[PDB]
Symmetry: D3
Subunit: 166 residues, 6 copies
């Protein structure tokens, strides 16, 4: 493994570019291990919490314990902004340095699924994001989890390029 170092790089733009292609945005979502869920707290300030997730058919699924911090907040305002990003890559253009990454952002409202069988279905979507293993859930386990359904009302993607030239 090797590195390229420069003595005389001059900082320049960053430009973001919008990703239009829905499959490409979904690809980012599907590649991500965690997501960052923004919730407005009880004082009107941001709260960002990382969480595991599943995604299918314009819908995000999460799960948590049944209380409290983020739960109290969602009960007051259930609008969430869920953001995803993969690491940056470093690209040298031939000289020129560019550090590039991409992200997805989903906005929607949180429901807590109550039906026991719907909860299992959703829990399966979440687990399938991380393993091919078969999961069972006892009734008491399904009872002691809140399963979040977030139909995605707006889904966007962005490429960010941070640039420097010699």
């Amino acid at each position: 493994h090797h590195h390229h170092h420069h003595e005389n790089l001059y900082f320049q733009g960053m430009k973001t570019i919008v990703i239009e292609d829905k499959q490409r945005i979904e690809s980012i979502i599907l590649q991500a291990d965690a997501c960052f869920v923004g919730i407005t707290d009880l004082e009107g300030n941001p709260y960002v919490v990382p969480m595991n997730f599943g995604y299918e058919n314009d819908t995000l699924y999460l799960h948590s314990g049944p209380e409290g911090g983020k739960i109290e907040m969602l009960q007051r305002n259930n609008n969430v902004c869920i953001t995803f990003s993969l690491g940056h890559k470093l690209v040298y253009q031939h000289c020129s340095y560019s550090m590039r990454s991409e992200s997805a952002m989903c906005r929607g409202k949180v429901e807590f699924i109550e039906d026991m069988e719907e909860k299992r279905h959703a829990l399966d979507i979440i687990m399938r994001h991380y393993t091919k293993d078969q999961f069972s859930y006892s009734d008491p386990a399904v009872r002691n989890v809140k399963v979040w359904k977030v139909p995605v009302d707006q889904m966007t993607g962005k490429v960010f390029g941070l640039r420097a030239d010699e």
Copy 2:
């Protein structure tokens, strides 16, 4: 490379544990490539934006273009929640499956640094997070960037363990 698959895993708890050790929380921050900045939007809903950053001496530094989306929001409410996380690891206990990750969260208020030399200093903290290369910034480049200073008022860390047993 190899994988372990099970036919009969039963979902169980997730538990979060609080990370008290400040150096350990800072280690997470220092390991992270990007951070997820939560801002309350103009309607009171969450907006989470990934961004590059630097961290030193209980202070986060970011930079952006001088407008608009996130800028308009910060001008109305400059409280931000900035969250960091490293990938999950998979641990098999010997049977038992555990998927474990850790995160940091910083809460503080955003200033936009106006002094040209302070802006360069801060830009250096940000760049040093990603490379050892020396960056210069022309005056016009320093002018055309907003450099965000976020003294961290509360910094917390959390380990999350998602568990299943045979």
Copy 3:
């Protein structure tokens, strides 16, 4: 990195499974760095040659010098079987050992594209398989390469599982 060794494994089946999903077969093709081109030689015996390639719209593209070995053969019989495979993965089922891989196979006939502009187009499909860089081709370079077009008449995929149990 770690390994699991067993003292008492008993060899069992191999089973192949057919992959029906065309996008999944194309995914294998798109993941592969090289392909293995089977040509019948002048005596009726197999000749398998690895080659770089591009794939779009049920068509494979290759390129070579304008002579000789494989060229003489194709001039007598231009039917080729082009095969692709990704490495094996090792999966332990929980005990049981399974070594699993997947492959694609395309059958079609080889044309040598003569039009200079068609040759460039095809050469672009091939290069785009390996890099995002822009390639130019002088006229003399386009002249001194044979560009193979292989419309795919049959495309199949297979998963192979080699199994052992304790």
Copy 4:
């Protein structure tokens, strides 16, 4: 990890070079996870099938179920061309781009080993290519596999270099 991209690359030669050194060709064979077996089908056209293998003392060993597709073909013509290749490497010469790989090719005739103990011996050569684990084979397992012995009559190696310059 980083990438180098160019705006103005001009495609040039590919050259193959012959690898004379037998130990070097055997090294390629020994590094490979799978091999691509070319068989002439019943209509005289190529059939290329990937397969696992072992190699010792100028002899390749494979195994399969006792029927059918490739078996019917080998019963008509047991000449096979078995080809191996490792991934390409990318080399920048300092500018100049070169994508380089190497391959081996073995030509020989297929026997199906009938003696039960010879079959086990050969199966061991194959397994030792992939693991250090001890494999047993019940009699019924040895019965229900065809074990292919292919003394190698011609073994060749080739380095291929695909080149572009600025």
Copy 5:
């Protein structure tokens, strides 16, 4: 993965630089998987033996069987030089080639811990260097190992840079 090759590199200096920062030297020690223990043999010549180790609070811990080669030597001279190094990195300065690594060196004297409980404590420091797993040690296992304690009297670090220019 890619490589950069040059036709016309001119060998130049190597320079070592002293690492003053104790935490940085300890970081090297903590990163290392093995250490190389120098012992003067019975004829006055060097003997360098690799070994696993633990490090805490300016003290190195090792363990071995209770005899013989290195044991006889230490009984005559228990001064040891224990050296650590991480792989080299390759850095291209933009042209210029630099191959850089770092090492730590600890000098101290070896005791063999006799108290059974002290031996377990030390064995724990060693194991914690390699895994988070809980180890037990039967009395007979603790008896049949020599546990080496080496208070570090001098600890130094060095960066070595091997350089070539175009």
Copy 6:
């Protein structure tokens, strides 16, 4: 990537095994990035210094500045013990934990090559250990380096296995 953790492991033996096969010992040497050179210091105590190296035909080659620390020592006693090791691997036997590595050790005497052309030859052996690039050496560069030749009088290899069982 995943890990296996145990609650109840019992420490056991370490056993070393002697590696007899000269090609296998040379393979370890050839795989190593650095070597650890033991020299007896001026007081009769060990000094272990890491260094780059080349190996061909039972001979090790190193290079350094023309002074001082290790040079003064070698002028009094030019016997060196040069040791090599590759990382450990972790092997789970199926339960049982084994951490395994291998090392080589070469004993010989150090000459400093004086002839300018011999020095270049040797410097080439060293560089070829790390890159395929062509190195030149001006006369003044060859003058300002000591090139060490160490015909290997004894070369040995050892596998070390550190074991724990459930």
